[PDB]
């Protein structure tokens, strides 16, 4: 199955220091393939350890430490037969994979940020919330945040 995982500021914009959210990201992606667009790959700056890193780009790859693919269908195929594929962004990539996804792992962060790019719109009635957990800010985490998992119920 295909899952998307994202951190969402106010208004679902995709500034804080949230080690707890990065731990959540790692726990939910470790030992799974991760699919990302080239801009997200460049931003991360190094492969995510313990995961197969699959990078979408229209152009030939430029780093032998990760696997490069040129289309959504190739990216999925390159994951093989695994129980769960994690799509880690960015916007362009989330838009393409959302219709194919069965799960969303979202962190709703209580912060407004400088950006006009939003997590894709999706029908609220297509999804069921199956987990949520709110945390206030503390000495290590600059803002309050809420983890959520949603499972798809309809197309
Ligand atoms: N969207 C906005 O409103 C906005 C506003 C300001 C700045 N930005 C900038 O946009 C960038 C992030 O955009 P993002 O989050 O959407 O990027 P992303 O998903 O991380 O990466 C997009 C890149 O992934 C590749 N890709 C995606 N789908 C593909 C497909 N089906 N086949 C082949 N390649 C595919 C392309 O790489 P190739 O280019 O190598 O083909 C594409 O340019 C940042 O640099 C940010 O500063 C965006
Ligand atoms: N919940 C969530 N939070 C994010 O920050 C996030 C997300 N989802 N989905 C995609 C994404 C894209 N950017 C990034 C940037 C850095 C790491 C990263 O460094 N992860 C480490 C965490 C451990 C650490 O660095 O202290 C990892 O091994 O996963 C991951 C994704 N970021």
From Swiss-Prot:
Key words of the record: NADP, One-carbon metabolism, Oxidoreductase
NCBIfam families per the UniProt record, alphabetical: PRK10769.1
Catalytic class of the enzyme: oxidoreductase
Function per UniProt: Key enzyme in folate metabolism. Catalyzes an essential reaction for de novo glycine and purine synthesis, and for DNA precursor synthesis.
Protein family per UniProt: Belongs to the dihydrofolate reductase family.
Pathway(s): Cofactor biosynthesis; tetrahydrofolate biosynthesis; 5,6,7,8-tetrahydrofolate from 7,8-dihydrofolate: step 1/1
Name of the protein described by the UniProt record: Dihydrofolate reductase
Substrates-to-products reaction catalysed: (6S)-5,6,7,8-tetrahydrofolate + NADP(+) = 7,8-dihydrofolate + NADPH + H(+)
One GO term describing the cellular component: cytosol
InterPro entries listed in its UniProt record: DHFR (IPR012259), DHFR-like_dom_sf (IPR024072), DHFR_CS (IPR017925), DHFR_dom (IPR001796)
One of the GO BP terms on file: tetrahydrofolate biosynthetic process
Domain spans labelled DHFR: 1-152
Molecular function per GO: dihydrofolate reductase activity; NADP binding
The organism's taxonomic lineage, starting at the top: Bacteria, Pseudomonadati, Pseudomonadota, Gammaproteobacteria, Enterobacterales
Entry-linked SUPFAM superfamilies: Dihydrofolate reductase-like
């Amino acid at each position: 199955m295909i899952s998307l995982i994202a951190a969402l500021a106010v208004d679902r914009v995709i500034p804080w220091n949230l080690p707890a959210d990065l731990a959540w990201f790692k726990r939910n992606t470790l030992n799974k393939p991760v699919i990302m667009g080239r801009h997200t790959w460049e931003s991360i700056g190094r492969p995510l350890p313990g995961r197969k890193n699959i990078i979408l780009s229209s152009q030939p790859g430029t780093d032998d430490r990760v696997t490069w693919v040129k289309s959504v269908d190739e990216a999925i195929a390159a994951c093989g037969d695994v129980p769960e594929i994690m799509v880690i962004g960015g916007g362009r990539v989330y838009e393409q994979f959302l219709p194919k996804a069965q799960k969303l792992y979202l962190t709703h962060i209580d912060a407004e940020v400088e950006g006009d790019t939003h997590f894709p719109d999706y029908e609220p009635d297509d999804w069921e919330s199956v987990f949520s957990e709110f945390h206030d800010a503390d000495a290590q985490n600059s803002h309050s945040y809420c983890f959520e998992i949603l499972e798809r119920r309809h197309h």
